[PDB]
Ligand binder design. Sequence first.
Ligand code: EED
Ligand code: EED
Lengths: 10, 12, 237, 239
Amino acid sequence: KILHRLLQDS
Amino acid sequence: HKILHRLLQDSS
Amino acid sequence: SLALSLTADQMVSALLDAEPPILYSEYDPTRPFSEASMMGLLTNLADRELVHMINWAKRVPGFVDLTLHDQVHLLECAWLEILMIGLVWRSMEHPGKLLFAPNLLLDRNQGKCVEGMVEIFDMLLATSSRFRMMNLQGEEFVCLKSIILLNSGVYTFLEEKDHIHRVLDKITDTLIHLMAKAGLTLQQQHQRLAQLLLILSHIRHMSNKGMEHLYSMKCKNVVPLSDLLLEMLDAHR
Amino acid sequence: SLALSLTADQMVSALLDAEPPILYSEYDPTRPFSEASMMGLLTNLADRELVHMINWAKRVPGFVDLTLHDQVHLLECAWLEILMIGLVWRSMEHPGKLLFAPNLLLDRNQGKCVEGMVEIFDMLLATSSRFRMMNLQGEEFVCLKSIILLNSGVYTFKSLEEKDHIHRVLDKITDTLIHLMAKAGLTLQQQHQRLAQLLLILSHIRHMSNKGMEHLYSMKCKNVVPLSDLLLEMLDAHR
Ligand SMILES: COC[C@H]1C[C@]2(C)[C@@H](O)CC[C@H]2[C@@H]2CCc3cc(O)ccc3[C@@H]12
Ligand SMILES: COC[C@H]1C[C@]2(C)[C@@H](O)CC[C@H]2[C@@H]2CCc3cc(O)ccc3[C@@H]12
């Protein structure tokens, strides 16, 4: 979940 | 007395 | 398909420019090490490094073309390998020491503070000695780190698979170009390409051992891990 | 300096002639599997295979030049990697199946017969599909298997000339893989790309060995299978 979010944020 | 040791010395 | 259009020199430039910064640990010299506190330091560092890694990965040619699910899987697979190859690279000019951070340079005897860790430090140190022996170059280092990202999780996934392999092939062209321009002979070029990729076998092994160790430390409540680390770890089980 | 003087064709020649035999399983095909029986078949097979692996290794050019201690270390590090690449290779022409022996060809659903095993089967099957996709050749396979032997434990090594000799032998095998590719008519670029593709397989092989060793170990502890003294020793080397 968290990795998935971080990959969109940058 | 590792088996490997002995197998290596006895290899064919 | 813009990764596929890059020249070798443009590949290198993109990768060098994508390089994450070298971060500091929270090492406090006012207190002595314990197993818990050293594991706290290393994992706190890794957690901060991970954020910079996700941003680096997005700058690796071709990676952005993959689905979110594909990007998650590759990073979940290779993250510790990527942390490790950086460490070995950072430690190159410090024989007998592992430069986790500029304020955290540890020898094997300091590794002994954490149960089971010294065996892993020995492997990382041996691998850094290989790097030094080979005179590994920064441009070569960035190619290898990117190949790890794209390769480690690639078979554990159909047209995006073909796309990954195209990019991987372009990194190979790039490695050879670097060697040719550095004046290696044709024979030296293929012999070195092989030597460099055999490194990745060792980096994989060290990662697998490291993951088992970290999981051990989690399961005996030695250190609390960030939610991100808990999730990255849980991917391997 | 016997192994440094071999030509590419003589290297392939020696590796081809050193190949171990393909062993059969002691499996009777009228009896269903259980977790215990399947682990028994796989490890019994592997134990017999290890004895032939030792004769093979001693025939890998340059290997007999190393000290007994070093030989032991390399085989202890690489043994399951070596069993696995053999497995993957002989399953190449059987999509979706792992050919452990000619009378023991197992599907992914049969991996589910042992706890935690289907995940390993899936990795092995994906590697085999890669071999098939690359059209991996027999001469390339024996090269790759020899590289695993010599490489996997090479940095865990005062006689520093041992490491250097072994690195020369590795370079010869690279030259041998390249020779095979040039002979098949690949352009330079294609040779280099293929060499890299084949070597990246070894990262995946190493991964599968480490997982396989964790699994075998879990199976040992909960006593699902009794292992030979050789196997217990080969397993003890990794922890
Ligand atoms: C996620 O923490 C990474 C740490 C902690 C370990 C995984 C220990 O459990 C065993 C090996 C340790 C890692 C070695 C590689 C490494 C590299 C970094 O850049 C930061 C931390 C770490 C270690
Ligand atoms: C030593 O036994 C090897 C056996 C059993 C395993 C290690 C299981 O515990 C998990 C992975 C299994 C091996 C996969 C590769 C392999 C190859 C052979 O040629 C014979 C047996 C085996 C499996």
